[PDB]
């Protein structure tokens, strides 16, 4: 039909637009800028207890507790000053690819290959852990889940959407659709009023949690992206994809700023996180190794290396201390 | 140098740590299949053979042995995403009907559905049970119509034992890796009470080359 | 519900054996720490003796050890203090407390009915002054404790813990870990306090306020309860 020529001929309007704000780039006004220098980073913790991969953790607002979710069935809330396992929740699917710990710390989330996503109540009364809260609803495998408040959570799946649920009442109070493949990851903003999500048709669109509608959409990657992480200033954010090069997109100026790019990597990219100041990139790879990017310079400042496996899962805390690592030989490393 | 409450704390550590290594060691003498086939094949038959959307995940038990079988068929997305979660199963059970060497051929895309899991980057070494299905129904369309409109190198014979014989050989060699894995193939029908029994004594043999890998002899 | 009713007790000979029960009802009894914690008839709360999740760790008053026997049936989900021998000190309700230890956790959370056992005729010391003060309902409070060694560990933890006893009731958490308040428990209470100097203030007193209320301290057994403060009308 001719709706396809309309169509093309928005979307050059929009390479257009987006082409004539670029006033520089980012290397030649980060060109006066002192680098960081060789980051050396060592193992610290080393947590040990999973028996299958490690698909997903998550570190805890008070900086100190961290949650690990892995195929053989457990979720695992570690206390990471002391590596004591402070709860093993065990779960009724094994196929976990994502968990989350929710913002005040009472709740804990995972889903994965049965298509739901599990809310279990820490904090309770009769001592044990148990289930909350199963959220079903999606038709493709949950790939992220992230905590907006204790009764809000948005999850990602691979049926192309993503939701924003109530865990209340137990249902999708929005629906985030767009996408044509597979949603991978998520990221919420800071004051959690939008969020990013990459998809395996190399687009990240930004979202809108209030009204679910798509409020922009990045390009720039050739294959599936795998990885997103927001800057701590809320305006950008990097993802991470499967032709192993990470990106620094921008909201603000709907356009990519940075490649973060070595030909001495030919693999993908499965986790992204940034430190607390947004001046490095944390990025875990397929070569069983972490990479440490100077975010404003682009160069490999450090290199985290530790893992025997595939290092699935990334993150840094929320005081900016540690980094943990968790790979696919069941080991989560607390670097710092 | 510890608390009086972090000795406590430090105990109840090692005590989930204690249910966590049982558990696991509970929980690796398990028999962990992967169901796989085109649609329409035999998995649903063979589900129901053996005496019993996302995973769906059957449980079942022949003489001392845990079997948990893992039908993949209703999860309608990137196949690219999620395999590797199925990195490290026992046995692949691959469903392929004998039947669609005419339909629409249909016997083909069987045929590259093997070869794209046979030679995956994770199942390496994974071994493959291969159910060839209704043979008794692929013999009753093998009067009428010739194998050589699926295979046109067939220099053989319309007889039912011969071009079963060529179907089993045409799947067999896809594998590249000839040494790291095998393939253990059989003909079954909805009448024989016996198609478990080639399960079983085909993952004893996985079974016992598992123990003899870790033992170091690959 | 959460119920830990106890059982045995009454008139015994003194020199005979006794045992107590705690039948624990509504909770996951095999994950919890458990507490034997004696109570004079006009004194205040001393502690008697500690089990640990699955048994491992097993510690006595220094006045009570050799004579008595904590012990736990973890499938029937029941707490048994067998005692020998029984002095005239040993005349006493005896409380049954739980508590799980990890990081975060409260400790002393839940206590028991109590049992009344009628016999016929270098610890930290923890002081408390015994101020049973007066105070007119609807205004703030102050109560004082005070150590004989530094509570602050070298973790950050102020292991001190507050405890309201209502008249003819169990007691109950009301502050743990010096700071952090237990749940169920309306904010008004505040815990504060340095090393060996520690109060709780109570603003706007309403009722179910007056009582007893205790410092007990947790970092190193044996836990030596305060004497005690009877807030009144």
């Known amino acids: 039909d001719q709706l396809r020529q309309e169509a093309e001929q928005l979307k050059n309007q929009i390479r257009d637009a987006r082409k004539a704000c670029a006033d520089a780039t980012l290397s030649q006004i980060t060109n006066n800028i002192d680098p960081v220098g060789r980051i050396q980073m060592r193992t610290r913790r080393t947590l040990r207890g999973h028996l299958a991969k490690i698909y997903a953790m998550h570190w805890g607002t008070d900086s100190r507790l961290l949650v690990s979710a892995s195929q053989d069935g457990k979720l695992i809330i570690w206390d990471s000053y002391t590596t004591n396992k402070v709860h093993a929740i065990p779960l009724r699917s094994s196929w976990v690819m994502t968990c989350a710990y929710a913002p005040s710390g009472n709740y804990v989330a995972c889903g994965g290959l049965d298509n739901i996503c599990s809310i279990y109540n820490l904090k309770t009364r009769e001592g044990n852990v148990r289930v909350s809260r199963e959220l079903a609803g999606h038709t493709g495998y949950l790939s992220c889940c992230r905590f907006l408040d204790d009764n809000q959570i948005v999850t990602s799946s691979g049926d192309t959407t993503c939701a924003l649920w109530d865990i209340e009442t137990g249902q999708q109070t929005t629906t985030f659709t767009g996408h044509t493949g597979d949603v991978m990851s998520l990221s919420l903003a800071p004051d959690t009023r939008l969020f990013v999500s990459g998809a395996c048709d190399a687009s990240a669109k930004l979202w809108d949690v209030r009204e679910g509608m798509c409020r922009q959409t990045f390009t720039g990657h050739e294959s599936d992206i795998n990885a997103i992480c927001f800057f701590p200033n809320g305006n950008a954010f990097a993802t991470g994809s499967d032709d192993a090069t990470c990106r620094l997109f921008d909201l603000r100026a709907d356009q990519e700023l940075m490649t973060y790019s070595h030909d001495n990597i030919i693999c993908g990219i499965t986790s992204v996180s940034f430190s607390k100041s947004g001046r490095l990139l944390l990025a875990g790879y397929d070569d069983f190794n972490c990479n440490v990017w100077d975010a404003l310079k682009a160069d490999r400042a450090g290199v985290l290396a530790g893992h025997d496996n595939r290092v699935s899962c990334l993150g840094v805390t929320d005081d900016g201390m540690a980094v943990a690592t968790g790979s696919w030989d069941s080991f989560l490393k607390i670097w710092n | 140098t510890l608390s009086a409450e972090d000795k406590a704390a430090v105990e109840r550590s090692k005590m989930i740590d204690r249910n966590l290594r049982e558990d696991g060691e509970k929980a690796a003498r398990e028999v962990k299949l992967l169901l796989l086939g085109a649609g329409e094949s035999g998995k649903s038959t063979i589900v129901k053979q053996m005496k019993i959307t996302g995973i769906v995940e059957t449980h079942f038990t022949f003489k001392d042995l845990h079997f948990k079988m893992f039908d993949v068929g209703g999860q309608r997305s990137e196949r690219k995403k999620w395999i590797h979660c199925f990195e490290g199963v026992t046995a692949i059970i691959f469903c392929v009907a004998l039947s669609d060497y005419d339909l629409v051929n249909r016997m083909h895309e069987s045929m590259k559905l093997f070869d794209s899991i046979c030679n995956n980057k994770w199942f390496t070494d994974t071994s493959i049970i291969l159910f060839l299905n209704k043979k008794d129904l692929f013999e009753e369309k093998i009067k009428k119509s010739p194998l050589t409109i699926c295979y046109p190198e067939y220099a053989g014979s319309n007889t039912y034992e011969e071009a079963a014989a060529y179907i089993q050989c045409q799947f067999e060699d896809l594998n590249k890796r000839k040494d790291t894995k095998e393939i253990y193939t059989h003909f079954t029908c909805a009448t024989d009470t016996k198609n478990v029994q080639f399960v079983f004594d085909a993952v004893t043999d996985v079974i016992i080359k598992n123990n003899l890998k870790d033992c170091g002899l690959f | 519900d959460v119920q830990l009713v106890e059982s045995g007790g009454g008139l015994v000979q003194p020199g005979g054996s006794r045992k107590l029960s705690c039948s624990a009802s509504g909770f996951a009894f095999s994950s919890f720490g458990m507490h034997w914690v004696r109570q004079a008839p006009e004194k205040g709360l001393e502690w008697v003796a500690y089990i640990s999740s699955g048994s491992g760790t097993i510690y006595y008053a220094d006045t009570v050890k050799g004579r008595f026997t904590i012990s736990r049936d973890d499938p029937k989900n029941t707490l048994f203090l067998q005692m020998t021998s029984l002095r005239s000190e040993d005349t006493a309700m005896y409380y049954c407390?739980?508590?799980?230890?990890?990081?975060?956790?409260?400790?002393?959370?839940?206590w028991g009915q109590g049992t009344t056992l009628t016999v016929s005729s270098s610890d930290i010391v923890m002081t408390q002054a015994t101020s049973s003060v007066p105070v007119t309902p609807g205004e703030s409070v102050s109560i004082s404790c005070r150590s004989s060694?530094?509570?602050?560990?070298?973790?950050?933890?102020?292991?001190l813990y507050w405890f309201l006893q209502r008249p003819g009731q169990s007691p109950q958490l009301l502050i743990y870990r010096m700071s952090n308040l237990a749940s169920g428990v309306p904010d008004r209470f505040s815990g504060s306090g340095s090393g060996t100097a520690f109060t709780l203030t109570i603003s706007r007193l309403e009722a179910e306020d007056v009582g007893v209320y205790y410092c007990m301290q947790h970092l190193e057994y044996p836990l030596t309860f305060g004497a005690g403060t009877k807030l009144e009308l």
């Open positions: 407390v739980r508590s799980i230890y990890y990081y975060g956790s409260s400790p002393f959370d839940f």
């Open positions: 060694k530094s509570l602050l560990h070298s973790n950050g933890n102020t292991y």
